[PDB]
Amino acid sequence: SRRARIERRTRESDIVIELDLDGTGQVAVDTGVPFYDHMLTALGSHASFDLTVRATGDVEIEAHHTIEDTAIALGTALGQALGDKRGIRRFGDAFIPMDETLAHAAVDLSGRPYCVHTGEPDHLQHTTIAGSSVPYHTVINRHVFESLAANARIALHVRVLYGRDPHHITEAQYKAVARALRQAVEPDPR
Amino acid sequence: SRRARIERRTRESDIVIELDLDGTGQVAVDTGVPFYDHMLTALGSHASFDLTVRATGDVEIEAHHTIEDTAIALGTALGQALGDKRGIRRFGDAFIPMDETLAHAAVDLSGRPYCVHTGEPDHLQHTTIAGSSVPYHTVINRHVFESLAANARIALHVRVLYGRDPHHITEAQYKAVARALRQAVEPDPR
Amino acid sequence: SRRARIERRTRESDIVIELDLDGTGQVAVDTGVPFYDHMLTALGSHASFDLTVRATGDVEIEAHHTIEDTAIALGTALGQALGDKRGIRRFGDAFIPMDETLAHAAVDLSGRPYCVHTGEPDHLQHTTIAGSSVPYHTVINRHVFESLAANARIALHVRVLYGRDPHHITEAQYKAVARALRQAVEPDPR
Amino acid sequence: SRRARIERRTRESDIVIELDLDGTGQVAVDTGVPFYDHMLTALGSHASFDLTVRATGDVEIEAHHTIEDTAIALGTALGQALGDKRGIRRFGDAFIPMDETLAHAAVDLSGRPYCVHTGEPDHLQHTTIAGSSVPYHTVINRHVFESLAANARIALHVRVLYGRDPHHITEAQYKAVARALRQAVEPDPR
Amino acid sequence: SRRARIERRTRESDIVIELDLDGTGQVAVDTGVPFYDHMLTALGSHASFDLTVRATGDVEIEAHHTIEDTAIALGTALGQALGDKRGIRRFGDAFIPMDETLAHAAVDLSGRPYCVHTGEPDHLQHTTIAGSSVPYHTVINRHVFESLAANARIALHVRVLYGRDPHHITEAQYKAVARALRQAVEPDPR
Amino acid sequence: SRRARIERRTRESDIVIELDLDGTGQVAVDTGVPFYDHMLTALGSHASFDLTVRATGDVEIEAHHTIEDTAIALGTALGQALGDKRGIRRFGDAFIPMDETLAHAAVDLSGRPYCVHTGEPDHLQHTTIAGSSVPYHTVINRHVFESLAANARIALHVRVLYGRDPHHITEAQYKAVARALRQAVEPDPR
Ligand SMILES: [Mn+2]
Ligand SMILES: [Mn+2]
Ligand SMILES: [Mn+2]
Ligand SMILES: [Mn+2]
Ligand SMILES: [Mn+2]
Ligand SMILES: [Mn+2]
Ligand SMILES: [Mn+2]
Ligand SMILES: [Mn+2]
Ligand SMILES: [Mn+2]
Ligand SMILES: [Mn+2]
Ligand SMILES: [Mn+2]
Ligand SMILES: [Mn+2]
Ligand SMILES: [Mn+2]
Ligand SMILES: [Mn+2]
Known part of the structure; x- marks a missing residue:
């Protein structure tokens, strides 16, 4: 469907x-x-x-x-x-506590394409998350959220209220987007 | 009913x-x-x-x-x-992303009459929204929310997290109040 | 009389x-x-x-x-x-609370012509109050009070203690002048 | 009557x-x-x-x-x-000197419900007045004046110009409200 | 069950x-x-x-x-x-307006034990709430929320956005935790 | 009498x-x-x-x-x-506008002996008002108001809101005390 x-x-x-x-x-x-x-x-x-x-x-x-x-x-x-x-x-939002991190996302699914990303600590502009494979530069977080909003044609506001760990900051944000999206896409019985 | x-x-x-x-x-x-x-x-x-x-x-x-x-x-x-x-x-809240603007509202419907309005950019204290008819001075936003809360006998907190456009700032707020209200007035199955 | x-x-x-x-x-x-x-x-x-x-x-x-x-x-x-x-x-004064606004006026009816206008928020120097007709620029408030005092030959001190709404700030002032005047002009039984 | x-x-x-x-x-x-x-x-x-x-x-x-x-x-x-x-x-106001304290109150009895409370020293937000019985936390002063104005449907502005003693600051305010009220409720012969 | x-x-x-x-x-x-x-x-x-x-x-x-x-x-x-x-x-959050106070709480029920408490005015670190019985020192608010999160094994973030009255600040927080918890524990139909 | x-x-x-x-x-x-x-x-x-x-x-x-x-x-x-x-x-107060000067006085006639004098420009601490006779040092203004209050056993608060001329500042104050006193001493029909 x-x-x-x-x-x-x-x-x-x-x-x-x-x-x-x-x-x-x-x-x-x-x-x-x-x-x-x-x-x-x-x-x-x-x-x-x-x-x-x-x-x-x-x-x-x-x-x-x-x-x-x-x-x-x-x-x-x-x-x-x-x-x-x-x-x-149509509208959805979610808070994600992840240890010391708090992130938040709000969406308007019928709103014109727009992204605002605020509150992410400065050190994420040059932080690398690396294992045994291809690494992930956290500076890309913004870029991901912008590309999503622009190509889905939705309003997407993503916030970090506070946080320290780059894995936590990043994951809380993605999870925040996810549950904001989930609430928004659900049928409204009115 | x-x-x-x-x-x-x-x-x-x-x-x-x-x-x-x-x-x-x-x-x-x-x-x-x-x-x-x-x-x-x-x-x-x-x-x-x-x-x-x-x-x-x-x-x-x-x-x-x-x-x-x-x-x-x-x-x-x-x-x-x-x-x-x-x-x-009884309790309700809603985030409204509107392009560059993010506004929020929270209500307590059984709480005593009270309004707090914060975060609205300073230039809205003297901004006019004008067309071919009677204009709207955005300084009135506060006054509207106060009159609502005082005469409905409810707690109404309205926030602008950030925003630039006076039409967006204002509309996001009204929409924020609306959906906070909507959630609050709904029957609770408990 | x-x-x-x-x-x-x-x-x-x-x-x-x-x-x-x-x-x-x-x-x-x-x-x-x-x-x-x-x-x-x-x-x-x-x-x-x-x-x-x-x-x-x-x-x-x-x-x-x-x-x-x-x-x-x-x-x-x-x-x-x-x-x-x-x-x-001869002497009169009045406080006018108007919602968030507090304005005050004091008069000396036999004092030499003089006006001092203080405390009015800065944004009133360029605020317009506009409807379906000829608009009112609040920068004129001062000018009105000065013209009154100079041509009535009275001392007129008008204060805004605080306020936000330009309609409230302005009206409280006019009402303040009015009741200060009223007290002053009344017969003294002494 | x-x-x-x-x-x-x-x-x-x-x-x-x-x-x-x-x-x-x-x-x-x-x-x-x-x-x-x-x-x-x-x-x-x-x-x-x-x-x-x-x-x-x-x-x-x-x-x-x-x-x-x-x-x-x-x-x-x-x-x-x-x-x-x-x-x-309709309008009333009163200054109350109480030793080192000066408090003031102004009312509009036909004005819409509104309270503004200013000038009270910061230490009253956590001061206790205590005897042999149930104590009084002065942080409640504001709350009392707000509840009064909201339920009487009046404009009530209460000021402390200055003061040191919490009993004096508090009492001068209550007395200020009282005499502002007294003047306001009196019949006007005009 | x-x-x-x-x-x-x-x-x-x-x-x-x-x-x-x-x-x-x-x-x-x-x-x-x-x-x-x-x-x-x-x-x-x-x-x-x-x-x-x-x-x-x-x-x-x-x-x-x-x-x-x-x-x-x-x-x-x-x-x-x-x-x-x-x-x-699993995830829950709630805003509690209580007169001049706004408090908020967010929970992750499957997240590892963690508490962050922010935004509470400084005077609550030494405020006492006292009646005819054993008094309550508001400095304990933090301690309560930490003990809860640590022993329930949950993520609990509690915020005061703003507030003045210590009874309101404290109660809004407890109520905030309560409704965040309520939303989180509810069965998810997905 | x-x-x-x-x-x-x-x-x-x-x-x-x-x-x-x-x-x-x-x-x-x-x-x-x-x-x-x-x-x-x-x-x-x-x-x-x-x-x-x-x-x-x-x-x-x-x-x-x-x-x-x-x-x-x-x-x-x-x-x-x-x-x-x-x-x-018992209670009395008066505003005195005198050209550029505004002075104010408030009294409690049954209050314990007390005087507070505020707002007088600093140059009055060393200003002399001199004619063809014995001169008047305006630094004495305070001393006069204190001696009055202490020996009448009354509360007397005298303010200069603003002013420039030492003769005006001084006279407005004395006149302010006078009319505050006048209102206070009058019979109360209640
Ligand atoms: Mn790219
Ligand atoms: Mn992970
Ligand atoms: Mn928030
Ligand atoms: Mn629109
Ligand atoms: Mn002109
Ligand atoms: Mn004053
Ligand atoms: Mn109005
Ligand atoms: Mn009007
Ligand atoms: Mn007492
Ligand atoms: Mn302990
Ligand atoms: Mn309360
Ligand atoms: Mn309670
Ligand atoms: Mn001496
Ligand atoms: Mn003279």
């Missing part, structure tokens, strides 16, 4: 997205950027979507292009899946 | 209000102040009220008296329609 | 004033500037004068000249009506 | 108020909070009311609820006793 | 807690500290729990130990009653 | 005071300090007293001792003339 399959082939990367807005958290994400995978998994799960993200890109350069194309593709999927947006709550 | 008709005749103006708390957004507002109409329409609609506002006043002086009498009358209607306030959610 | 009729014909405007100091608030003001009318009505009423103000002027330029000629004419009327000022209270 | 009997039964407390606006200072106050009693006695006396306040409440918690219910009940009594407010002075 | 009985015997105090998460606000609290009772009653009621708290302690020293043991015991009860936390909303 | 004759013989000076509180402004002052005479004349006149002040002192030193003994003697006269202070207004 509220589904979308988006394929996005660029010079930089290759994306397939399958999205059901009315899902049960059946989520599989594989972008070649394992922390991004973890964030998008949290996103799909906490928004109660069913979501498959499969992506390959110029990860030898860094994660930027792949992260960005995926977020654009995902936004496009969200917009198409929403259709005419009839009889939905 | 939860309805009220209020007539308010002053020297300055003439108000009729018809209010159903359990409506479907059937809203008709005509106060002779077209931006106020637009705000009260957004209010009635987003609160899921059925609302008729019909008002005429000394608009040759300016909109103040008409805007104020209407808000008093509307508050009085809200209070009467609420009755004894039995088995309702 | 304490009456005066003043006619004032200038190039800019045309004023007729009828003033009874010992009135009952029978007040009719028509200057072509509806907010000024509202202020002068509050003035006449709250001072317990009987007052007729009829004025036409170069309102296509703006209200300044008409507002100013009227205030001069009204001051002249006040002075003439007062006569030799024998056996009157 | 201008009387009211108000009974107020809440979960927190039990209030009976008998009020004659045109009294001779026949005042009896018993709320279980002896400093509050002393303040309300000063209020009734200095306003030249005849006043009986009898109150019992959850004073084991602290005085807040009892103090608040009493002030609400008293405000309601003031409003009802005032009736249509015909031919009264 | 979601119940717990906790007995806690320390050298300092003696606590029995009975908790039903799926209650109707049947709440009875008796700790020998009447303001604490009032706060815990508001907590149980506004969270829609059924709650019995019975506590005796070394109240001759002061309320600290009793307040702390009770909060630990209550946290332990909350954790046990929650069980495996299957199919619940 | 309310009269007093006070004789005060010190080493420094010689004072006779005759005071009728219920006078018509029949005032004769001769202290050998002509500006003091002018101030005390304004005082007696504006308070509607009948007052005779006759004083000689060590004016070769300067006016201080004579000014001070006279003010003490006058205070003593005021206190004795007031008697038991039965059925009087």
Whole structure:
């Protein structure tokens, strides 16, 4: 009913997205950027979507292009899946406490495309989250949220009230977006 | 069931209000102040009220008296329609993203009459919103929210987290009040 | 007994004033500037004068000249009506709370012509109060009080202790002047 | 002629108020909070009311609820006793010097419900006035004046110009309200 | 179904807690500290729990130990009653306007034990709330929220956005925790 | 009825005071300090007293001792003339605009002896008012008001809100005291 399959082939990367807005958290994400995978998994799960993200890109350069194309593709999927947006709550918001971190997100699904991202500590503009694979530069958080809002055609305001740990700050934000989205997309019985 | 008709005749103006708390957004507002109409329409609609506002006043002086009498009358209607306030959610809140603006409202419907309005940029104390008709001075926003809370006998806290455009700042606030109200008035199944 | 009729014909405007100091608030003001009318009505009423103000002027330029000629004419009327000022209270003062606003006025009716106006928020130097007619620039408040004091030959000190709304700030001041005047003009039984 | 009997039964407390606006200072106050009693006695006396306040409440918690219910009940009594407010002075104000303290109050009895409380030294936000009985936290001063104004439907502005002693600061304020009220409620011979 | 009985015997105090998460606000609290009772009653009621708290302690020293043991015991009860936390909303938040005060709370019920308490005015670090019985030092607010979160094994973030009255600041916080908790514990139909 | 004759013989000076509180402004002052005479004349006149002040002192030193003994003697006269202070207004206040100056005074006639003098520009601490005779050092203003309050056993608060001219600042203050006194001493019909 509220589904979308988006394929996005660029010079930089290759994306397939399958999205059901009315899902049960059946989520599989594989972008070649394992922390991004973890964030998008949290996103799909906490928004109660069913979501498959499969992506390959110029990860030898860094994660930027792949992260960005995926977020654009995902936004496009969200917009198409929403259709005419009839009889939905439209507005949604969620607070996410994650240890010392508090993040928040608010959405207007029928509002014109817009993103404002505030409150994220300055050290995230140059922080790297790195494991045994391709690393994730947290400076991209903003870029992800902007690409989502611009391609879904929605108003998306994301806040960090406070926080210290970059993994917590980042995850709380993604989870915040997820549950704001979840509340917004739900049918309104009025 | 939860309805009220209020007539308010002053020297300055003439108000009729018809209010159903359990409506479907059937809203008709005509106060002779077209931006106020637009705000009260957004209010009635987003609160899921059925609302008729019909008002005429000394608009040759300016909109103040008409805007104020209407808000008093509307508050009085809200209070009467609420009755004894039995088995309702009582507390409500809503975030409204509107482009660059984020506004918020929280209500306690059984709390004593009180209004606090914070965060609105300073230039709204002397901003005019003007078309081909009677203009709207945004300095009145505060006055409207105070008159509502005082005459409905409710706690109403309205915040602007940030914003630039006076139409957006103002509308987000009215919409914020509306959805905070909507959540609060709903029956609680507990 | 304490009456005066003043006619004032200038190039800019045309004023007729009828003033009874010992009135009952029978007040009719028509200057072509509806907010000024509202202020002068509050003035006449709250001072317990009987007052007729009829004025036409170069309102296509703006209200300044008409507002100013009227205030001069009204001051002249006040002075003439007062006569030799024998056996009157002479001193008067009044506090006017108007919602968030507190204004105050003090007068010495036998003191030499003098006006001091303090405490009015800065944004009133460029605020406009506008309806469906000729607008009122609040920067003129000072000018009105000065013209009154200078032409009535009285000491008039007008204060705003605090306030936010320009309509409230302005009206409280006019009402403050009115009741200060009322107390001052009353016969002293000593 | 201008009387009211108000009974107020809440979960927190039990209030009976008998009020004659045109009294001779026949005042009896018993709320279980002896400093509050002393303040309300000063209020009734200095306003030249005849006043009986009898109150019992959850004073084991602290005085807040009892103090608040009493002030609400008293405000309601003031409003009802005032009736249509015909031919009264309407405006009133009073300065109260009390040793090193100067306090002031101004009222508009026909003005919409509003309270502004300014100038009280910061240490009163956490000062306790304590004897052999239930103590009085001066932070409640504001709360009392707000409850009065809101339930009497009057404009009430209360100022401390300066002061040091918390008993003096508090008492001067209550006395200030009292005499402002007294002047306002008096018949106007005009 | 979601119940717990906790007995806690320390050298300092003696606590029995009975908790039903799926209650109707049947709440009875008796700790020998009447303001604490009032706060815990508001907590149980506004969270829609059924709650019995019975506590005796070394109240001759002061309320600290009793307040702390009770909060630990209550946290332990909350954790046990929650069980495996299957199919619940998990996240919850609530704004509480209480006159001039605005407080907020957000919870993650499956998040690791953590508490952050911000925004409470400085004077609450040394404010006493006192009646005819054992007094309540508001500096303990933090301590209560920390003990709750640590023993329930939950993330609990409590904010005061602003406020003046210590009774209002404190109560709004407890009520905020209550409704955040209520939303979080509710079954999720997804 | 309310009269007093006070004789005060010190080493420094010689004072006779005759005071009728219920006078018509029949005032004769001769202290050998002509500006003091002018101030005390304004005082007696504006308070509607009948007052005779006759004083000689060590004016070769300067006016201080004579000014001070006279003010003490006058205070003593005021206190004795007031008697038991039965059925009087008790509280009084007056604003005095004098050109650019605004001064104010408030009194409590039954309050314990106290004086607070604020707002007087700093240059009055070393300003001299001089003619063809014995000069007047304005630093004495404070001293006069203190001696009055201490010897009349009254609360007397004197303010300068603003002012420039030392003759105006000083005279407005004396006149302010006078009319505050006048209002206070008047019979209260309640
Ligand atoms: Mn990019
Ligand atoms: Mn993680
Ligand atoms: Mn208004
Ligand atoms: Mn917030
Ligand atoms: Mn719009
Ligand atoms: Mn001019
Ligand atoms: Mn003042
Ligand atoms: Mn008006
Ligand atoms: Mn309260
Ligand atoms: Mn006392
Ligand atoms: Mn401890
Ligand atoms: Mn309480
Ligand atoms: Mn000396
Ligand atoms: Mn002079």
